[PDB]
Short mmCIF file of C-alpha atoms and ligand atoms in Angstrom, two decimals:
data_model
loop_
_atom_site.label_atom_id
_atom_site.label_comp_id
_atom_site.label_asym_id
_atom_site.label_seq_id
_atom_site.Cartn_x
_atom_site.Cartn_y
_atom_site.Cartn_z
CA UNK A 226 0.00 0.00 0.00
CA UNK A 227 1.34 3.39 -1.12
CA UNK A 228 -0.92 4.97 2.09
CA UNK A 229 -0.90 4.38 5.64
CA UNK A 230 -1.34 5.54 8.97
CA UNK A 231 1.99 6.36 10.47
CA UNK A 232 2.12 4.67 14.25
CA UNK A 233 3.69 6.86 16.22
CA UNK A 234 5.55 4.38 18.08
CA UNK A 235 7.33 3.39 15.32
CA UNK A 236 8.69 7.02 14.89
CA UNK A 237 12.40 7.60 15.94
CA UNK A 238 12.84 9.21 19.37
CA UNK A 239 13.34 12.83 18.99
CA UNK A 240 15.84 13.98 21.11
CA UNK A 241 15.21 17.57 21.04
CA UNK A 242 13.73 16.24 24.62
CA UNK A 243 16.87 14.95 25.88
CA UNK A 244 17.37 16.46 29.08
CA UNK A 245 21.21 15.60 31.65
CA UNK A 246 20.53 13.19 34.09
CA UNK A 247 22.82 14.36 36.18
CA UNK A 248 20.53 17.39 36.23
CA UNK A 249 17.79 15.94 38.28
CA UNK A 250 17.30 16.07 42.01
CA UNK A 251 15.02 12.71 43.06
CA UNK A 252 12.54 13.56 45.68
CA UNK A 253 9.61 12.09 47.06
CA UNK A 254 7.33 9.19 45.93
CA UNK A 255 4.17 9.97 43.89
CA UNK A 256 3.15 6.81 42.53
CA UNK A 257 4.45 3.14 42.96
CA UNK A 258 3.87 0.07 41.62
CA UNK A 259 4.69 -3.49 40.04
CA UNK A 260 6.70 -1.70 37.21
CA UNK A 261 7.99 1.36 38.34
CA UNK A 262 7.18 4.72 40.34
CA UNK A 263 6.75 8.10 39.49
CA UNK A 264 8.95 10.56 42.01
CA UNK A 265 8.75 13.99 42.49
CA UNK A 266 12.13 15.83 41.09
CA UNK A 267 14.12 19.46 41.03
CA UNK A 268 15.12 19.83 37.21
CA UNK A 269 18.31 22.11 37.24
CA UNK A 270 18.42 24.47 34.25
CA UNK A 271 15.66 22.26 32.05
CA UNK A 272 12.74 25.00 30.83
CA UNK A 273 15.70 28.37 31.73
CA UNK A 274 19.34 27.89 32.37
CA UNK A 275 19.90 29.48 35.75
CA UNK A 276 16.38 28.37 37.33
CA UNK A 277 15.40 24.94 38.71
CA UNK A 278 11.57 24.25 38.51
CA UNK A 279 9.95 20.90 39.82
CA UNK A 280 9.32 18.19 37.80
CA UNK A 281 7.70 14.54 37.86
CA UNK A 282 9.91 11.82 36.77
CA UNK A 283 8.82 8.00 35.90
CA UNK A 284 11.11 5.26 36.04
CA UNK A 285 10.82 1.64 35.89
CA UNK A 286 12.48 -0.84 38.21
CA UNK A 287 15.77 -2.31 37.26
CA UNK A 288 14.23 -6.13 36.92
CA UNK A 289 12.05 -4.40 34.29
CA UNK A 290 11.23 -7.19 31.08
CA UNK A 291 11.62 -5.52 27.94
CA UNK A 292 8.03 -5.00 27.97
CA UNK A 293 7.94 -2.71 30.36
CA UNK A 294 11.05 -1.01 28.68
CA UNK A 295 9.47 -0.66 25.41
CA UNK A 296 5.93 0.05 26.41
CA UNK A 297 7.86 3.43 28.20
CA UNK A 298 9.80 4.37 25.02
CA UNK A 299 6.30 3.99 23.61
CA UNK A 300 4.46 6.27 25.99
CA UNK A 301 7.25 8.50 25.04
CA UNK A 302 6.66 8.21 21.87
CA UNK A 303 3.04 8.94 22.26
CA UNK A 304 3.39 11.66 24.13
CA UNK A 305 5.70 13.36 21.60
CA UNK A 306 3.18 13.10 18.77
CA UNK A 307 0.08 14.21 20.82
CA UNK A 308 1.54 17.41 21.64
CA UNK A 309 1.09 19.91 24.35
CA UNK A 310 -2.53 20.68 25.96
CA UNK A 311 -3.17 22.81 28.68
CA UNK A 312 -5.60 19.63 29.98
CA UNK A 313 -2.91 16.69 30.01
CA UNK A 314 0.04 16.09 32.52
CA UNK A 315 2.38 17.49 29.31
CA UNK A 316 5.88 16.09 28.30
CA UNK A 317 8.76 17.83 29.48
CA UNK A 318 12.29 16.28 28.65
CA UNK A 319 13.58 12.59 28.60
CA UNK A 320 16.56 11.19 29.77
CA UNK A 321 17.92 8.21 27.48
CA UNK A 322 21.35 7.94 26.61
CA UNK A 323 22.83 4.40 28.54
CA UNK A 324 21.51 4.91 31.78
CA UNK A 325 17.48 3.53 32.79
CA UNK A 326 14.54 5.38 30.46
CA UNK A 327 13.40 8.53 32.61
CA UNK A 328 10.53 10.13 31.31
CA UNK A 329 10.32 13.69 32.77
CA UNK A 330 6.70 15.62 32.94
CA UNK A 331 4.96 18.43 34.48
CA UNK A 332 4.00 18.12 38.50
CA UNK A 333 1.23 19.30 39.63
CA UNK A 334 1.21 20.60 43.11
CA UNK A 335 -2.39 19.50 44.66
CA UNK A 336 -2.03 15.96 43.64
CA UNK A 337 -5.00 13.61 42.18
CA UNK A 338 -8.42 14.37 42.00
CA UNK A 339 -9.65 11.88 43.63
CA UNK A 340 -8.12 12.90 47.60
CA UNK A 341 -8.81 16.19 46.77
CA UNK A 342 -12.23 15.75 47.02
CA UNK A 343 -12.47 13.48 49.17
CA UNK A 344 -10.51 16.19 51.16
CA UNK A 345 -12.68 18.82 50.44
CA UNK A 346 -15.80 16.82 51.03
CA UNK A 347 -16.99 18.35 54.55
CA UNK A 348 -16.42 21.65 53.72
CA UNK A 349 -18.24 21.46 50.28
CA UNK A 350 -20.55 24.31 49.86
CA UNK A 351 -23.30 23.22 47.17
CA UNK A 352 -12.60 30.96 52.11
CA UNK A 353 -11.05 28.10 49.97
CA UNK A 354 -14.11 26.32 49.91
CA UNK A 355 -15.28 23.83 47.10
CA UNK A 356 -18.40 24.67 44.90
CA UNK A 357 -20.80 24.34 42.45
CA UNK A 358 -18.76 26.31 39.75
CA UNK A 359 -15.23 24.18 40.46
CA UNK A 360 -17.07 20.97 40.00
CA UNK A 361 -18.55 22.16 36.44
CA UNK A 362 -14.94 23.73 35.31
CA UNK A 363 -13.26 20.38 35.80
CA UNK A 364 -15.98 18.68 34.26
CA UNK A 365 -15.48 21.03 31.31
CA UNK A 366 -11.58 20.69 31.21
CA UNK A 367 -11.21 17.00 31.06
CA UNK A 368 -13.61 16.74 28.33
CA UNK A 369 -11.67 19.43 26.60
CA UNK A 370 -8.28 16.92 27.20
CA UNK A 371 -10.09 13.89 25.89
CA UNK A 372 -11.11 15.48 23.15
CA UNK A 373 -7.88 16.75 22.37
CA UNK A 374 -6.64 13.51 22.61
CA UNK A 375 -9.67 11.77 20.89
CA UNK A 376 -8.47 14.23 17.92
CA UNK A 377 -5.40 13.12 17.76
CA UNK A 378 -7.05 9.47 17.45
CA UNK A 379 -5.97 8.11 21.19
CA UNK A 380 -7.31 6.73 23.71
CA UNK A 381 -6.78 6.73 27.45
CA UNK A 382 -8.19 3.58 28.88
CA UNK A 383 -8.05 4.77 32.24
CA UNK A 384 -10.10 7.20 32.85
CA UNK A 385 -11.14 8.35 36.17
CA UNK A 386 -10.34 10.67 38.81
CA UNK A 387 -7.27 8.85 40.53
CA UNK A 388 -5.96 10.01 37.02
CA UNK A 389 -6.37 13.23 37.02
CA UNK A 390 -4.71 16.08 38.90
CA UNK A 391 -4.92 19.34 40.00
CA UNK A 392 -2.46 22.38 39.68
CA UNK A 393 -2.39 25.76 39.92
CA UNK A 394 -5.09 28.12 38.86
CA UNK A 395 -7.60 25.12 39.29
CA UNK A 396 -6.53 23.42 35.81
CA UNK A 397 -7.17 19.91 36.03
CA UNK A 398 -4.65 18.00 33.81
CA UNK A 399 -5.52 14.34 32.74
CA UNK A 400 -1.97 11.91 33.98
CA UNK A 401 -1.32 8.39 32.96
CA UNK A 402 -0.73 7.42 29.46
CA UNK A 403 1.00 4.58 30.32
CA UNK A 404 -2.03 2.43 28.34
CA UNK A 405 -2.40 5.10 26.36
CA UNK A 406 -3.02 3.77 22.33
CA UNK A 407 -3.37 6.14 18.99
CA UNK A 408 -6.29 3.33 17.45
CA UNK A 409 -6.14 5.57 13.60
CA UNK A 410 -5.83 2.22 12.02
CA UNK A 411 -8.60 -0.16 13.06
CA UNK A 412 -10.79 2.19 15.43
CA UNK A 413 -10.26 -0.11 18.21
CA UNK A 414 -7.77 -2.10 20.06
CA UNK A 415 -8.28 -5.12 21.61
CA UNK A 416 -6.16 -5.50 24.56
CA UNK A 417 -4.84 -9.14 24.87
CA UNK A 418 -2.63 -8.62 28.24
CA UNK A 419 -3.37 -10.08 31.46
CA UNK A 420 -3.24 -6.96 34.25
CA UNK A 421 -5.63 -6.10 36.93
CA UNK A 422 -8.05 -3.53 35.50
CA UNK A 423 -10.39 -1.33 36.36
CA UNK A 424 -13.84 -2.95 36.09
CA UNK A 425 -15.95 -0.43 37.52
CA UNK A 426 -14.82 2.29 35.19
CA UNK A 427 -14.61 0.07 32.41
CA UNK A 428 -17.67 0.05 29.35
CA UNK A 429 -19.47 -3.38 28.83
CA UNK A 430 -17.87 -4.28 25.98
CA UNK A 431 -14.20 -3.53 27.41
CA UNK A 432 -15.09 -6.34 30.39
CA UNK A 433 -16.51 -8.69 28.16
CA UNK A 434 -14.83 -8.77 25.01
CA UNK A 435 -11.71 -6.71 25.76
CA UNK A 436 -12.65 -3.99 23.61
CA UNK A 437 -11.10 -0.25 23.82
CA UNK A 438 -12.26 2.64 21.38
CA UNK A 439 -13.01 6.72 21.88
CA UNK A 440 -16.90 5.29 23.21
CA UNK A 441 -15.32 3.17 25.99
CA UNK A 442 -13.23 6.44 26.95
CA UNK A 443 -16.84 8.00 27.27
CA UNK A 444 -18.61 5.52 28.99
CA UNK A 445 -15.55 5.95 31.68
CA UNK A 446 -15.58 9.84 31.87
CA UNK A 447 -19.21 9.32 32.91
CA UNK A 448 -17.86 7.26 35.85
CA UNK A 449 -15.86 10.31 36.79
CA UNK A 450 -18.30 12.68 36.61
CA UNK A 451 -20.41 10.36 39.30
CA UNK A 452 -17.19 10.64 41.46
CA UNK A 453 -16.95 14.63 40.55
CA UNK A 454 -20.22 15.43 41.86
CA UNK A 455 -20.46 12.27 44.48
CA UNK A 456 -17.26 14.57 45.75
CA UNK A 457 -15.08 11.40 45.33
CA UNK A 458 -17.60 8.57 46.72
CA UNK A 459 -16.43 5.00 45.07
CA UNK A 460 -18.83 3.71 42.14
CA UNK A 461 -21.50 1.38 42.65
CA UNK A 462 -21.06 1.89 46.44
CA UNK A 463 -22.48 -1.61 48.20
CA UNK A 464 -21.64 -3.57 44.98
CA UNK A 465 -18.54 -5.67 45.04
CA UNK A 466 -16.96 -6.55 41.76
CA UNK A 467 -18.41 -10.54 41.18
CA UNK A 468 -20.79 -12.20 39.37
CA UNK A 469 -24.22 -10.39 40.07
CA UNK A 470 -22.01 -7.24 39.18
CA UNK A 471 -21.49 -8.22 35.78
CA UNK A 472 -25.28 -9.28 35.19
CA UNK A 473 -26.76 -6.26 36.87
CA UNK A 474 -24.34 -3.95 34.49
CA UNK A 475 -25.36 -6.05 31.23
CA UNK A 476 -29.17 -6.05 32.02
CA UNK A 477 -29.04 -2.09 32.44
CA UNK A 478 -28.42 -1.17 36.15
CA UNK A 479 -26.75 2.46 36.40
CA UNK A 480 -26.04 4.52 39.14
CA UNK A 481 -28.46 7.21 39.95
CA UNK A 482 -27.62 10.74 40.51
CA UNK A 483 -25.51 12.08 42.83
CA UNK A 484 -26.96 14.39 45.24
CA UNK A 485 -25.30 17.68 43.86
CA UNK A 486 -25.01 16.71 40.09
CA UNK A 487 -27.13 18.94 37.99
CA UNK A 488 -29.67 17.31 35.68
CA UNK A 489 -28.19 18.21 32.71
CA UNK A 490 -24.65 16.93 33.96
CA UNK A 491 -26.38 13.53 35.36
CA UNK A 492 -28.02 14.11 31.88
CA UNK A 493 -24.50 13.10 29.92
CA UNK A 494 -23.91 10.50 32.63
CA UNK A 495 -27.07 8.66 31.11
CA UNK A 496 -25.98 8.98 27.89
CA UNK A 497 -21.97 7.62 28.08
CA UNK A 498 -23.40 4.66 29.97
CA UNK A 499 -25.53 3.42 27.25
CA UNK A 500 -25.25 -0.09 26.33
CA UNK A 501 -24.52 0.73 22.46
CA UNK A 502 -21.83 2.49 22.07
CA UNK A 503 -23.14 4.38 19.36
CA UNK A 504 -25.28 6.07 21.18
CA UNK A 505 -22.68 7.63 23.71
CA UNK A 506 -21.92 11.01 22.92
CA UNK A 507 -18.13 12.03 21.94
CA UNK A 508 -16.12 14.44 23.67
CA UNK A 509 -16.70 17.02 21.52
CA UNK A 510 -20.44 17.11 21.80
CA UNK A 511 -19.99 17.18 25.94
CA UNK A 512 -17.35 20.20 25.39
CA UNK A 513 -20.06 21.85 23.57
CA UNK A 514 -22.73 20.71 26.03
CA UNK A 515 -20.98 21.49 29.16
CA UNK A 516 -19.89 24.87 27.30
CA UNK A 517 -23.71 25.81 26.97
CA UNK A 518 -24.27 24.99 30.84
CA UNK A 519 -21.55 27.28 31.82
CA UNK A 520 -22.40 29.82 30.25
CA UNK A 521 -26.25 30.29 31.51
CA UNK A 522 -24.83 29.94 35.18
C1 LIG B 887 0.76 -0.16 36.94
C2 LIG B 887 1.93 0.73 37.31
O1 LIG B 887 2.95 0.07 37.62
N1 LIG B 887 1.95 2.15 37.32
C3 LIG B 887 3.04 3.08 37.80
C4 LIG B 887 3.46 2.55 39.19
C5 LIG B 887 4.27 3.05 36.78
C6 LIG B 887 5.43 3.77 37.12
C7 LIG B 887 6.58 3.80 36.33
C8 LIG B 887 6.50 3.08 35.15
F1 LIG B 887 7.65 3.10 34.34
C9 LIG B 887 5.42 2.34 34.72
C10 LIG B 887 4.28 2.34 35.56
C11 LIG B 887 2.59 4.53 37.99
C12 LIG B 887 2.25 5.40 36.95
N2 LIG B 887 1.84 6.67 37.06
C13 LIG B 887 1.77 7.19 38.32
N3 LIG B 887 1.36 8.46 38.54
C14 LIG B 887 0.70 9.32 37.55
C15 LIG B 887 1.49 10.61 37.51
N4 LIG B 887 1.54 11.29 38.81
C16 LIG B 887 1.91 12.65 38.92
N5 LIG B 887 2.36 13.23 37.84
C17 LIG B 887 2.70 14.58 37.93
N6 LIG B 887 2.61 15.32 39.01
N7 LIG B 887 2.13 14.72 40.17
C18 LIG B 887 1.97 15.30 41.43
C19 LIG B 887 1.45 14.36 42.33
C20 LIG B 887 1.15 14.60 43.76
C21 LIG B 887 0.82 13.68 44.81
N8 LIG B 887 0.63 14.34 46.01
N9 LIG B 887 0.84 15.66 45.77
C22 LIG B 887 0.74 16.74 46.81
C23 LIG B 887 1.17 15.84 44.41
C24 LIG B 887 1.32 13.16 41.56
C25 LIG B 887 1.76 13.37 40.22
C26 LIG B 887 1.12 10.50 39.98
C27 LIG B 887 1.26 9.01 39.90
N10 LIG B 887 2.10 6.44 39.44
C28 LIG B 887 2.50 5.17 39.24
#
């Protein structure tokens, strides 16, 4: 074929984001897990020569397989062709010359989204108090993220509020494209590994046929927006993941509103949970929705 798609991951590294290793500062913990962790770092001279600024850094363990290894390159490599948004943890520099991968990123001072609310919770006011008009904005500013990255022809596959984070200026930034997959070829991508996943954020057709595609992004950003406006209560509270779960989700059960959700936000939560995925709505119809509550507030 004289045409194709062009995989990103096939794309040399570009090291206009090589950054000195012996320029970073390790601090703190952020994230840990089987694989890896991400630590907070001081980059020395990395955006301006004389200045040090904070950074994230992710890192896998040294008994890494070469699966892990590659699938960083490749969220590397992903995050080099998707580009900077204001709405995604962005690419900052990359440290791979002999030493272990390092892939450096933005921090974000207030951490995930998930313990900020839950923080926040018994102060919520329906000061530095929580409100109404935060809840919307972040609503509005991850569904500006995943549709930038639904334009760029990726999906997340992890959507929820443990992945998202909070910075300065409350701009919520989407983190975590470590299962991150541009799908331009075949529209969807059938994931054939064998981790632990995330069942009650996951669509249907993703738990029963292993199915990923821009409508099983959707049907998980409706999840989060339960947690947004539950102020961080856990899905399908009472319901343990097990075989009456799976049959109650396939036969139609959904969660009903939570108690400060406005109807027309509970309104798209209907919608990205419906069984056929063609009748989810994409991002950029709940941008535009979302845009038109806003703006009669
Ligand atoms: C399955 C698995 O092994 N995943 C691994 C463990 C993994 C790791 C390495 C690897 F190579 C492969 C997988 C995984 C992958 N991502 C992550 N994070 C996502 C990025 N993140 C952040 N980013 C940017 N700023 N920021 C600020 C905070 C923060 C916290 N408190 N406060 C006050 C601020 C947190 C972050 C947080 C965690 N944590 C572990």
């Amino acid at each position: 074929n004289n045409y194709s798609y062009i995989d990103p991951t096939q794309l040399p590294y570009d090291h206009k984001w090589e950054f000195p290793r012996n320029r970073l500062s390790f601090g703190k913990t952020l994230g840990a897990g089987a694989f890896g962790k991400v630590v907070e770092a001081t980059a020395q001279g990395l955006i301006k020569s004389d200045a040090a600024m904070t950074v994230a850094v992710k890192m896998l363990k040294p008994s890494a397989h070469s699966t892990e290894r590659e699938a960083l390159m490749s969220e590397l490599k992903v995050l080099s062709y998707l580009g900077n948004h204001e709405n995604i943890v962005n690419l900052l520099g990359a440290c791979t010359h002999g030493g272990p991968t390092l892939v450096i990123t933005e921090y974000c001072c207030y951490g995930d989204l998930l313990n900020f609310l839950r923080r926040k919770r018994d102060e919520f006011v329906p000061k530095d108090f929580l409100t109404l008009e935060h809840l919307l904005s972040f609503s509005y500013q991850v569904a500006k993220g995943m549709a930038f990255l639904a334009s760029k022809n990726c999906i997340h596959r992890d959507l929820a509020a443990r992945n998202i984070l909070l910075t300065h200026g409350n701009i919520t930034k989407i983190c975590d494209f470590g299962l991150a997959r541009d799908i331009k070829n075949d529209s969807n991508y059938v994931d054939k590994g064998n981790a632990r996943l995330p069942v009650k954020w996951m669509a249907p057709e993703s738990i029963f046929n292993s199915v990923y595609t821009f409508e099983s992004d959707v049907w998980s950003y409706g999840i989060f927006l339960w947690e947004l406006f539950s102020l961080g209560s856990s899905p399908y509270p009472g319901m343990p993941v097990d075989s009456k779960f799976y049959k109650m989700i396939k036969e139609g059960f959904r969660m009903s509103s939570p108690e400060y959700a406005p109807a027309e936000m509970y309104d798209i939560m209907k919608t990205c949970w419906d069984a056929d995925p063609d009748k989810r709505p994409t991002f950029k119809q709940i941008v535009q929705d979302i845009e038109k509550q806003i703006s009669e507030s």
